[PDB]
Amino acid sequence: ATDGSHFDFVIVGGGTAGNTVAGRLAENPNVTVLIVEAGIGNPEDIPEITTPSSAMDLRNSKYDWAYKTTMVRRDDYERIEKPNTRGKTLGGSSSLNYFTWVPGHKATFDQWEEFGGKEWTWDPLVPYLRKSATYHDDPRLYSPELEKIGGGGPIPISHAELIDEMAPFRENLTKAWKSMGQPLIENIYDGEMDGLTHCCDTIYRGQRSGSFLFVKNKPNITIVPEVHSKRLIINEADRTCKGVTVVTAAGNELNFFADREVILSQGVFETPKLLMLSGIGPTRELSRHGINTIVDSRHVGQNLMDHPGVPFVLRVKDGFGMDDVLLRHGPKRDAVVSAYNKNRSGPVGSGLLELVGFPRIDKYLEKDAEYRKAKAANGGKDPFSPLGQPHFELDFVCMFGTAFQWHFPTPKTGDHLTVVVDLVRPISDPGEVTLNSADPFQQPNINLNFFANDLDIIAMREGIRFSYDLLFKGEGFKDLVESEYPWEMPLDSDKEMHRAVLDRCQTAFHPTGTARLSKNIDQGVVDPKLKVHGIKKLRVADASVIPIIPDCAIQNSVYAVGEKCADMIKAEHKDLY
Numbered sequence: 001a002t003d004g005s006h007f008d009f010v011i012v013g014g015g016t017a018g019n020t021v022a023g024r025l026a027e028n029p030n031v032t033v034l035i036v037e038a039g040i041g042n043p044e045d046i047p048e049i050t051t052p053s054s055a056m057d058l059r060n061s062k063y064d065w066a067y068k069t070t071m072v073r074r075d076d077y078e079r080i081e082k083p084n085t086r087g088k089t090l091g092g093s094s095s096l097n098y099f100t101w102v103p104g105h106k107a108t109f110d111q112w113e114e115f116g117g118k119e120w121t122w123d124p125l126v127p128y129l130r131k132s133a134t135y136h137d138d139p140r141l142y143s144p145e146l147e148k149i150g151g152g153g154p155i156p157i158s159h160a161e162l163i164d165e166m167a168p169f170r171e172n173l174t175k176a177w178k179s180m181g182q183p184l185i186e187n188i189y190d191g192e193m194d195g196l197t198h199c200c201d202t203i204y205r206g207q208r209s210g211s212f213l214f215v216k217n218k219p220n221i222t223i224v225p226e227v228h229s230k231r232l233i234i235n236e237a238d239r240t241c242k243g244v245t246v247v248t249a250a251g252n253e254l255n256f257f258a259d260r261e262v263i264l265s266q267g268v269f270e271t272p273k274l275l276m277l278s279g280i281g282p283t284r285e286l287s288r289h290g291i292n293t294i295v296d297s298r299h300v301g302q303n304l305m306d307h308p309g310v311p312f313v314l315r316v317k318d319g320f321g322m323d324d325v326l327l328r329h330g331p332k333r334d335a336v337v338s339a340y341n342k343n344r345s346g347p348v349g350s351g352l353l354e355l356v357g358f359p360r361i362d363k364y365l366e367k368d369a370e371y372r373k374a375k376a377a378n379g380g381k382d383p384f385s386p387l388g389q390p391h392f393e394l395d396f397v398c399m400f401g402t403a404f405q406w407h408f409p410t411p412k413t414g415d416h417l418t419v420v421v422d423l424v425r426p427i428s429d430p431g432e433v434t435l436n437s438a439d440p441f442q443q444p445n446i447n448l449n450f451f452a453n454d455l456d457i458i459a460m461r462e463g464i465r466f467s468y469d470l471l472f473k474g475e476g477f478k479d480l481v482e483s484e485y486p487w488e489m490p491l492d493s494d495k496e497m498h499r500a501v502l503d504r505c506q507t508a509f510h511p512t513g514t515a516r517l518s519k520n521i522d523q524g525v526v527d528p529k530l531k532v533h534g535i536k537k538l539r540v541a542d543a544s545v546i547p548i549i550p551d552c553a554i555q556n557s558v559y560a561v562g563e564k565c566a567d568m569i570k571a572e573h574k575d576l577y
């Protein structure tokens, strides 16, 4: 693209929400759309990206920003990690995520009204949660009612294309779940989600569904990959965003201008950073790095909220995990790889996550004196999920998962199950994204502030106990567990579990909230129409606008944010739509 070029709409960051907004705005073939993106433009040519079973190998690949991130910062414990994975490619993090497609709980979204008004509640958002996807049930295994989750969009979704060898695994896990007295549930898309489910996935016919499917074959979209954003171009007198400045691989600085609006979609970590480099952020933070303050927006980079997870691995009887087929070299792997390279069939096309649990653990919490005190102190309401939403998302990954064992080696033998104990309703205060400098090529400093509140530790511990009770005592699956890896979970000692939760936890990969939607600038950074408070012609569309983190994996809500952003943009530009 030519330096100085004008487009109707400029999307900064071709990620999950960015391409959604851009692709929807290009549906008038006369509207010009530009996308600037730091990573490659051709993710559909990359086997590791398009192949679902390769997803975990994308950590630390060239497609991963590989941020350093402080996981917990308590007086008694602190840990910083690398990589905290985020997609650096067209499609953003939808090009390297673990595929689960689940909206969340109606009570949670209804509370967004405090920030976005009544249009950001469950009932009005349901269509936006479905518009991006086209639902498939080719083997006709599930209720026809579930067709409603696909509104016809360009992201193909389906129930997991089940691995045949894992059917005994699935049957015993189901038997064990029911034997614990917890429900089975298949419709988790109407606002309720209590039980164990067959998850849906951004996978179809063994291929990853990435947001890049929004912006291909559209001559009115100009895609400029391999450029790094330097700054938003702001006119102070007009209080107007004009466009964006980027740096190319050759080190040249380019200006691109929007004649209607700029949409910032750089994700939860780079969106607040780019805002701050451009003069929009906490004035004292800006001054400390030599950046002039155009708008004192105290919430930029604040309210960073993510789901903590404590994963654990069990060695399981032979044939009840996929390690021997996909993780280890040999004839079995060669065979399924040959099949996949010819027609994309076989378990190489699997995301390896097929059953997902959304329990409450009230009976576990009630055994802890400190939880009981805290609930009574909250007037008798559960501090985590007072409106009946889940406490956990339990991903039962049917294999050893390196992306969930950050400090342990891969076992050299045996089949495994990786359980991701993902606390979806934490009550710890949020962390923050802050500037390290005015350098656009340095990462922001990132603190997730997991487990600031001791109660979240108590919950995560009990979520681990629930999972252990399920797998070691639950019927059918109890006969499949061979050992714990890499050592025993110290569930018999609360004091050791305290250390175990802090030292073994990680991000469940759901960061949100750093430019959140709100009614005014004293509450957040963008307004209910996703416009940056104090700036004209600037919207934000990505996970950073999310004001209350959903009760589950978040990609479904992120697409919805993009879908709604595009609709509100179209409604304002009547002369083009």
Ligand SMILES: Cc1cc2nc3c(=O)[nH]c(=O)nc-3n(C[C@H](O)[C@H](O)[C@H](O)COP(=O)(O)OP(=O)(O)OC[C@H]3O[C@@H](n4cnc5c(N)ncnc54)[C@H](O)[C@@H]3O)c2cc1C
Residues within 6 Å of the ligand: 012, 013, 014, 015, 016, 017, 018, 036, 037, 038, 039, 085, 086, 087, 088, 089, 090, 091, 092, 093, 094, 096, 097, 098, 099, 100, 101, 102, 227, 228, 229, 265, 266, 267, 268, 270, 271, 508, 509, 510, 511, 541, 542, 543, 544, 552, 553, 554, 555, 556, 558
């Ligand atoms: C490992 C992993 C697994 C996940 N698994 C799941 C799952 O199973 N289910 C689920 O629901 N969610 C999952 N997620 C979360 C989900 O993928 C993300 O929350 C979502 O994709 C975020 O979308 P976004 O548009 O806000 O940001 P992103 O998709 O990250 O888009 C940001 C884009 O901006 C670009 N960009 C950033 N900074 C710059 C810059 N300075 N210059 C130029 N371009 C820039 C990036 O390269 C990227 O393309 C996972 C996330 C990760 C990291």
